[PDB]
Amino acid sequence: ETITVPTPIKQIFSDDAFAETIKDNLKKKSVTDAVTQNELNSIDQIIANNSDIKSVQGIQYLPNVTKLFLNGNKLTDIKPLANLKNLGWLFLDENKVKDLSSLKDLKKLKSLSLEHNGISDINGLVHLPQLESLYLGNNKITDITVLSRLTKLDTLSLEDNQISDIVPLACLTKLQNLYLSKNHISDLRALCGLKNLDVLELFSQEALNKPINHQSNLVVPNTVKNTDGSLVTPEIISDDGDYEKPNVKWHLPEFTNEVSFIFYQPVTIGKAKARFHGRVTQPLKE
Amino acid sequence: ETITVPTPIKQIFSDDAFAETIKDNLKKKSVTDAVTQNELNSIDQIIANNSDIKSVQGIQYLPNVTKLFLNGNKLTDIKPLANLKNLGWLFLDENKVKDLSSLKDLKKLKSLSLEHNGISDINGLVHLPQLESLYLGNNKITDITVLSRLTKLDTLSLEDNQISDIVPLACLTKLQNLYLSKNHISDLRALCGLKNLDVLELFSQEALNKPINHQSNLVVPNTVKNTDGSLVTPEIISDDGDYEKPNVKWHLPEFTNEVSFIFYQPVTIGKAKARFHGRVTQPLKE
C-alpha cells in the first residue's frame, strides 16, 4: 500500500527500536516525525547493530537498500527482506533466523553473515549461487552438501558447528579464506585440492566415533587423516593408552564409558598454514 | 664384474630373447657376436615389445639407457633395473611385475606403464614423487591412498581396477588426463576440484554394497553421487523396482540373492566431459 502523504515513521515501522533506527538514519528529531516515499527511496544503507530489533516490518518500503547491518538484534523472520532486490550485503549475526527461503531471489546478494542464529538446515543457501562471502560460524550445522554449489565464494566461515564431512568443499576451488575450527573433522583428504587458500583454521576439532563395546584390551583404528591420507600420530592418549600404528590400543581392566586421544599437526594447503588439532572420543557399551 | 675383453652378447644377457634384442639394437649379425662396454655404453633406448623376454639379466651393464619399451613380455623381476639411474621412460605392460621396490631410486623416471601386471599393492609408487605419467590399467588395485603424493602427474590411468574410494585424487590438481572406467566408483564428490582436467573417462562402474538382509519390501539408500553431491537418478532398476528419492525400493515377495540398478549421467569437470555410468549391486542374506 502506497505512501501518498507524509506518514509517521512509527506507522510504517511497527518495531520501536527499528523506528528509532530509521529515524537516526534520516536525521529526524523524533520517531513521530513524518516521512515520504521519496526519503525512504534515498536509503542505501541501514546500520542497526545491537538494537534489540524484533521485526523489520516496514523495510519493504526501502527498495533501493543495498546494505543491511542487522547484527546483534532479536529477529526471527526476514520475509520483509524478500523483495529488497538490490540487497548486496546482509549481516544478521546473533539473531534467530532459521527460514532462509526469504533470500531465494536476492540475485545481487554477495555477502551474508548468519553467525550465532542456532541454524541447522542451510539447504536454502542453494538458491544463492552468486555468493562471495558467507559466514555461518557458531550454529548447529552438520551437513554442508549444498555448499558445493557456491563456487563464487572466496571466504567461508563454518567454525563452531558440528561438521564431520568436508568432502563438499572440494568444489570450492576459488576459496581463499576458510574457517573450520571447532567442528567434528578428522579426515582432511578432500581439502587437499584447494590450492588458492591463503588462510585456513582447523583447531579444536571434536571427532566422535560410533560406540563400540568395551573389552579389557581395546584396539581402535586411528581415523585421523592428514590431507595426503597419512594417519596423524596422536600426541596424548587417555587412560594410559598406546599407539601402535595404525591402531590406538588400551588396556582397560575396568569399565569406563569413554576413552580418547588428542592430536596436533601442522598442515599446508595452497599458501595457507593451519594447525589441525583435536580430540577423538570413543564411547564404549556394556 | 667389468667387461674388459669383447664378450659374447649371450654370456652377458642370459635370456635368449633379450640377447636377440640387444643383438638387433646394435645391428650385429648373430647373438654369439662379441660386444664391448663401449658399445653397451652407447645404448639410449631399447625397443623390446612382444618378445617373450623372461629376464633382463645383464641390462645392468647398460648405464646410459633412458628408455625401456618392455611391453608384452613375461618379466617377473625388475631388480636389474634398480641402478639404471638415467631411466626416464619404463613401459612394462602385460608382464607380471609386482615388486616395485626396484624403482625406488630412479629419480629421473618420468613415465611408467604397468598395465595388465596383476598388481594389487602399489605402495612402492610413493618413492616416485617426480612421475608425470602413470598407467596402471587392468590390474587389481583397490586402495589408491599413496597416489596423493604424485602431484606432478599430468596423466593417470586407473581403468579396470577395483577402486571405490577416489578421495586420494583430490591432491592431484595438475591432472589433465584421467581414466577411471571399469572401477567400483559411486561417489564423484572428491573429484570436483580437478579443474585442469581435459579428458576424463568414468564409464562402466560396478559399485557393490555391503550385503543387507532380504525383506519383501526392501528400501535401499541411493548412494550414487554426482560431483556436486546430488544423488544420481537410476535409469533402469532390476526386479521391477522403483525410485522414490532418496531410496530405491523393491517389492520382493520371493527371495533373490541380489538386486541392482544402472545409472548414466553426463559429468563436467574443468574442461573435461565424461559419462558417469554404471551399476550398483545389492546382495541379500537369509
Side-chain angles (χ1 to χ4, degrees):
Chain A
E1 197 86 86
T2 291
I3 305 182
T4 71
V5 307
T7 296
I9 286 173
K10 235 176 106 88
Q11 287 184 11
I12 298 162
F13 300 92
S14 69
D15 180 272
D16 293 336
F18 196 47
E20 283 300 331
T21 296
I22 298 294
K23 190 219 84 164
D24 283 326
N25 181 288
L26 296 172
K27 292 161 228 208
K28 299 306 204 192
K29 284 213 106 185
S30 156
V31 270
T32 62
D33 283 346
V35 287
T36 63
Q37 187 53 56
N38 303 337
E39 299 162 305
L40 290 183
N41 286 347
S42 66
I43 294 162
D44 172 64
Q45 182 181 250
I46 286 167
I47 298 159
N49 308 76
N50 294 14
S51 300
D52 283 333
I53 294 154
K54 298 153 182 161
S55 172
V56 277
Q57 184 51 229
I59 203 167
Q60 305 91 320
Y61 281 91
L62 284 46
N64 302 310
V65 67
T66 65
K67 313 188 245 318
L68 296 175
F69 290 79
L70 299 161
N71 289 354
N73 286 294
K74 284 166 167 216
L75 289 173
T76 54
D77 172 22
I78 56 162
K79 284 163 205 192
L81 302 191
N83 247 264
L84 286 5
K85 276 182 198 188
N86 305 292
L87 200 57
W89 297 347
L90 184 48
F91 310 116
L92 281 162
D93 289 352
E94 295 173 280
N95 295 268
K96 308 162 112 150
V97 175
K98 294 163 178 38
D99 200 342
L100 302 173
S101 55
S102 326
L103 311 177
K104 85 202 277 322
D105 298 311
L106 298 196
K107 302 166 167 50
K108 289 186 166 159
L109 181 55
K110 294 310 209 301
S111 193
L112 179 60
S113 199
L114 285 158
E115 309 216 317
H116 291 274
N117 277 256
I119 287 174
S120 58
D121 174 13
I122 51 155
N123 288 351
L125 297 179
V126 89
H127 291 100
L128 296 178
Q130 75 287 345
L131 269 185
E132 286 174 359
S133 53
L134 176 57
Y135 304 83
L136 277 353
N138 289 89
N139 281 294
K140 301 173 186 163
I141 293 162
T142 55
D143 172 359
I144 61 162
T145 295
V146 295
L147 298 188
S148 77
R149 192 194 184 182
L150 303 184
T151 58
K152 315 304 160 203
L153 284 174
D154 64 47
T155 289
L156 173 59
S157 179
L158 289 165
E159 75 190 346
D160 251 294
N161 279 286
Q162 292 172 44
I163 299 159
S164 44
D165 172 17
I166 50 68
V167 175
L169 302 180
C171 300
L172 306 182
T173 57
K174 289 176 156 150
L175 276 171
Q176 297 165 245
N177 305 306
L178 178 54
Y179 310 92
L180 284 176
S181 284
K182 301 165 87 196
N183 276 282
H184 295 3
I185 299 160
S186 60
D187 185 346
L188 295 189
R189 291 175 304 147
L191 296 186
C192 191
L194 300 171
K195 309 271 169 96
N196 290 306
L197 285 168
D198 225 60
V199 176
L200 175 72
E201 298 194 344
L202 285 163
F203 62 92
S204 311
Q205 305 301 321
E206 290 288 340
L208 182 56
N209 291 339
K210 283 187 231 201
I212 64 191
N213 280 299
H214 178 259
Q215 341 241 54
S216 55
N217 292 291
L218 204 79
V219 181
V220 178
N222 183 5
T223 45
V224 184
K225 309 291 181 51
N226 218 315
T227 58
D228 76 354
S230 38
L231 280 178
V232 174
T233 296
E235 183 172 284
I236 312 180
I237 298 157
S238 77
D239 304 280
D240 198 22
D242 290 308
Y243 193 44
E244 279 188 48
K245 204 202 218 153
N247 297 314
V248 185
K249 285 185 58 167
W250 289 265
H251 176 230
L252 305 160
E254 68 227 341
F255 175 77
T256 182
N257 55 224
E258 62 160 79
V259 292
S260 67
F261 50 95
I262 285 172
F263 63 90
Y264 172 98
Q265 177 112 145
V267 163
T268 302
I269 312 183
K271 297 196 133 203
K273 289 163 89 170
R275 301 161 73 117
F276 184 36
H277 149 254
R279 175 169 43 199
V280 180
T281 306
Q282 176 64 75
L284 299 185
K285 303 178 202 165
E286 289 206 64
Chain B
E1 197 86 86
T2 291
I3 305 182
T4 71
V5 307
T7 296
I9 286 173
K10 235 176 106 88
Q11 287 184 11
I12 298 162
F13 300 92
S14 69
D15 180 272
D16 293 336
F18 196 47
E20 283 300 331
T21 296
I22 298 294
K23 190 219 84 164
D24 283 326
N25 181 288
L26 296 172
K27 292 161 228 208
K28 299 306 204 192
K29 284 213 106 185
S30 156
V31 270
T32 62
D33 283 346
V35 287
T36 63
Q37 187 53 56
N38 303 337
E39 299 162 305
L40 290 183
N41 286 347
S42 66
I43 294 162
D44 172 64
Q45 182 181 250
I46 286 167
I47 298 159
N49 308 76
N50 294 14
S51 300
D52 283 333
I53 294 154
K54 298 153 182 161
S55 172
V56 277
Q57 184 51 229
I59 203 167
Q60 305 91 320
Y61 281 91
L62 284 46
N64 302 310
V65 67
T66 65
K67 313 188 245 318
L68 296 175
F69 290 79
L70 299 161
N71 289 354
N73 286 294
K74 284 166 167 216
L75 289 173
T76 54
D77 172 22
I78 56 162
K79 284 163 205 192
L81 302 191
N83 247 264
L84 286 5
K85 276 182 198 188
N86 305 292
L87 200 57
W89 297 347
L90 184 48
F91 310 116
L92 281 162
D93 289 352
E94 295 173 280
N95 295 268
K96 308 162 112 150
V97 175
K98 294 163 178 38
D99 200 342
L100 302 173
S101 55
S102 326
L103 311 177
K104 85 202 277 322
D105 298 311
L106 298 196
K107 302 166 167 50
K108 289 186 166 159
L109 181 55
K110 294 310 209 301
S111 193
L112 179 60
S113 199
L114 285 158
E115 309 216 317
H116 291 274
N117 277 256
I119 287 174
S120 58
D121 174 13
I122 51 155
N123 288 351
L125 297 179
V126 89
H127 291 100
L128 296 178
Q130 75 287 345
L131 269 185
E132 286 174 359
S133 53
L134 176 57
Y135 304 83
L136 277 353
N138 289 89
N139 281 294
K140 301 173 186 163
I141 293 162
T142 55
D143 172 359
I144 61 162
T145 295
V146 295
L147 298 188
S148 77
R149 192 194 184 182
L150 303 184
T151 58
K152 315 304 160 203
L153 284 174
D154 64 47
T155 289
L156 173 59
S157 179
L158 289 165
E159 75 190 346
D160 251 294
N161 279 286
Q162 292 172 44
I163 299 159
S164 44
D165 172 17
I166 50 68
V167 175
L169 302 180
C171 300
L172 306 182
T173 57
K174 289 176 156 150
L175 276 171
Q176 297 165 245
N177 305 306
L178 178 54
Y179 310 92
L180 284 176
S181 284
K182 301 165 87 196
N183 276 282
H184 295 3
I185 299 160
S186 60
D187 185 346
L188 295 189
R189 291 175 304 147
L191 296 186
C192 191
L194 300 171
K195 309 271 169 96
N196 290 306
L197 285 168
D198 225 60
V199 176
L200 175 72
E201 298 194 344
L202 285 163
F203 62 92
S204 311
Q205 305 301 321
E206 290 288 340
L208 182 56
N209 291 339
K210 283 187 231 201
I212 64 191
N213 280 299
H214 178 259
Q215 341 241 54
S216 55
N217 292 291
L218 204 79
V219 181
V220 178
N222 183 5
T223 45
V224 184
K225 309 291 181 51
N226 218 315
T227 58
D228 76 354
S230 38
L231 280 178
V232 174
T233 296
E235 183 172 284
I236 312 180
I237 298 157
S238 77
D239 304 280
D240 198 22
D242 290 308
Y243 193 44
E244 279 188 48
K245 204 202 218 153
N247 297 314
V248 185
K249 285 185 58 167
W250 289 265
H251 176 230
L252 305 160
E254 68 227 341
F255 175 77
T256 182
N257 55 224
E258 62 160 79
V259 292
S260 67
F261 50 95
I262 285 172
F263 63 90
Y264 172 98
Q265 177 112 145
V267 163
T268 302
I269 312 183
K271 297 196 133 203
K273 289 163 89 170
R275 301 161 73 117
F276 184 36
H277 149 254
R279 175 169 43 199
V280 180
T281 306
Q282 176 64 75
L284 299 185
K285 303 178 202 165
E286 289 206 64

